[PDB]
Design a protein around this ligand. Structure first.
Ligand SMILES: [Cl-]
Length: 206
């Protein structure tokens, strides 16, 4: 029961913070098990995984099944496409992590300012493919364009032409109809960082 106890302890410690119940089952032939007392294990965190087990003169490829139970983010109330994920409509549920659909959110902090891309039903695990970050800037919104660099500062008002989250690109129509583009910041401003532009900016003032 040596290898089974060692693998159980190894995956339990590796899964600290993800799971409080880790069960390991060997799927490969016991004839290909490491011979040494303390094999070095190395490596997907759970489910059907391959583990390399090294001993002096051995490099075993073990196939194991890892059952890991812990918390994951699930839908707690109906959420419409475009609906904000809140503490009223998404919660932590306890379940078999190894049976979850791909890219299920495990940490409730990952869903802060998230918005649903789909109509979601209660009990559904929240997957990264079902959600997006909220729009800090929305199409048609009055925004501030801030350009800085080479002893120059420009502050101008415009209308956001597209929806954009923080750190995403936003095109902005200036009052004349000229379109500029920059990065959305936490304040909903559009940031531009400035070779001929600093020369062009000064030339515009002439
Ligand atoms: Cl949004």
């Amino acid at each position: 029961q040596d290898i089974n106890a060692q693998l159980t302890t190894w995956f339990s410690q590796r899964l600290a913070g993800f799971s409080d119940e880790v069960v390991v089952t060997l799927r490969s032939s016991p004839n290909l098990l490491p011979s040494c007392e303390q094999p070095a294990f190395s490596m997907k965190l759970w489910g059907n995984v391959n583990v390399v087990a090294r001993c002096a003169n051995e490099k075993r490829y073990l196939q194991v099944n890892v059952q890991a139970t812990g918390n994951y983010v699930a839908v707690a109330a109906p959420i419409a496409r475009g609906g904000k994920l809140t503490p009223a409509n998404v919660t932590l549920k306890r379940g078999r992590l190894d049976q979850l659909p791909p890219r299920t959110v495990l940490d409730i902090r990952q869903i802060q300012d998230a918005v649903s891309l789909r109509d979601l039903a209660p009990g559904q695990p929240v997957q990264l493919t079902m959600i997006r970050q909220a729009w800090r800037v929305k199409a048609g919104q009055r925004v501030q364009v801030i350009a800085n660099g080479e002893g120059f500062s420009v502050n101008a008002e415009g209308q956001a032409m597209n929806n954009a989250a923080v750190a995403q690109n936003a095109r902005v129509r200036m009052t004349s109809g000229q379109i500029v583009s920059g990065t959305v910041d936490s304040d909903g401003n559009i940031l531009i960082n400035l070779s001929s532009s600093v020369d062009k900016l000064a030339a515009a003032l002439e």
